[PDB]
Amino acid sequence: TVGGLVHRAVDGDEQATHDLLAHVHPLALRYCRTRLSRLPGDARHFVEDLAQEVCVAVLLALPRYKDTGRPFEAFVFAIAAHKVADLQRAAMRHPGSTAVPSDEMPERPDDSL
Template sequence: MRDDVAGAAGQADPVEAEPSGPGHDPSYADSSYADPDGAVAGPGRPPVLGSGRPPVLGTGGSPLVGELVAAAVRGEGPAIDALLAYVHPLALRYCRAKLARLPGGARHHVDDVAQEVCVAVLCALPRYKDQGRPFEAFVYGIAAHKIADLQRAAMRGPGSTVVPQDDLPEVPDEALGPEEQALLSSDAAWAKELLSNLPARQRELVLLRVAAGLSAEETGEVLGMSPGAVRVAQHRALSRLRALAEESS
């Protein structure tokens, strides 16, 4: 499996230069979640739940997110507040990208669905077990279920114009390559370790494209990038993963 990652990432061809204009490019202060007075502004608006402040995470993202999740699972209040503040922008951007494609009223419920995701994450924390996959993938999985619930409810409503997701026009996009398939394989702990070495923006992009299954167009909606720029950034991220895989093999 590791050889698959090491040997295949170079197959994705960039199609255009990544723009240098404004977009979603979150950065976090290098501090501890337990210091609310040192909290810095993060992406998206703060959640209704929790402290109302974004969490303070290290620039690499993953290691401190893992510590944050572990503390929240133990029931530590400041960690729960900070984790919910971290989860809400992720859920909001994901829901906005997925619901924007739907006709009818479903797309107007982005904030409500994102809030439901936060509630579901909060309720799931006591039973959460780290199985090696990034915590963000867990959040995106919950969000996908909540969106499916909304779609089913909307289709049952009188006079609904919402159509099933499977009936929507397909968005042309490249199929998963061997490197993406490897990241979805059973060696999740190893893949998580590799992902933790990517910059936060690249890591989120790979998670959205691979773990959450978003198209390049949907990922662009989330990150404020064009579909072509998403493909370029994905190529760079996977090339970095290939180099990391070669170093660790």
């Protein structure tokens, strides 16, 4: 099952981690699809960029993944929510960055007389 797969992935096997991340991939995309699709900010299609990034986090957690029998799904949800919060503090803090095209070219005066 997945438990043994992650066990031999942390053992050091390349194919084990390969299959583990392959299985994590689509579930990460789908969870971020359901979570980030409604968040304030232009992130509806950035859910991919933090989905497989959770796998990057998995990569920085696997070598010291002292598993206690807990499923990896709660883990994945945890890092997904945490990276969602990271986006929240990156955007909503001084959220002056607005991609407005309709009120930028006519509304900007020119210093050169």
